[PDB]
Design a protein around this ligand. Structure first.
Ligand SMILES: [Cl-]
Ligand SMILES: [Cl-]
Ligand SMILES: [Yb+3]
Ligand SMILES: [Yb+3]
Ligand SMILES: [Yb+3]
Length: 129
């Protein structure tokens, strides 16, 4: 599914991401925009042989199992395919564990490089929340 901006903001809020670990909704939406362009089916292969999955580009080395990433720890206890579903619940659950892991949203390099310190409130402009 390719979410609209406000549609994804509403879904994230409904799944308890708004201000999770102190990160406002706009941070999450901005991160999704630059990780996946709001496309739940996005997949991308990393240089280390792992792959990133879903709206927030969660990896298969630490977080989910894809069966082809040696050293996989699967800390989210989820097949990586679950992170491609139209329903964002599995991605949100796993992202909550990621953002709690010590470095906050710096876990997402695109967040650090494109969202951190910017006017992230713009991502929720006009939305009926
Ligand atoms: Cl915000
Ligand atoms: Cl933090
Ligand atoms: Yb990646
Ligand atoms: Yb559902
Ligand atoms: Yb409200």
């Amino acid at each position: 599914k390719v979410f609209g901006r406000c549609e994804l903001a509403a879904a994230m809020k409904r799944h308890g991401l708004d201000n999770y670990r102190g990160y406002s909704l706009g941070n999450w939406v901005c991160a999704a925009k630059f990780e996946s362009n709001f496309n739940t089916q996005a997949t991308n292969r990393n240089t280390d042989g792992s792959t990133d999955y879903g709206i927030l580009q969660i990896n298969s080395r630490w977080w989910c199992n894809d069966g082809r990433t040696p050293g996989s720890r699967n800390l989210c206890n989820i097949p990586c395919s679950a992170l491609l579903s139209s329903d964002i619940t599995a991605s949100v659950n796993c992202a909550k564990k990621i953002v709690s892991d010590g470095n906050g949203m710096n876990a997402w390099v695109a967040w650090r490089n494109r969202c951190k310190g910017t006017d992230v409130q713009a991502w929720i402009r006009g939305c009926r929340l």
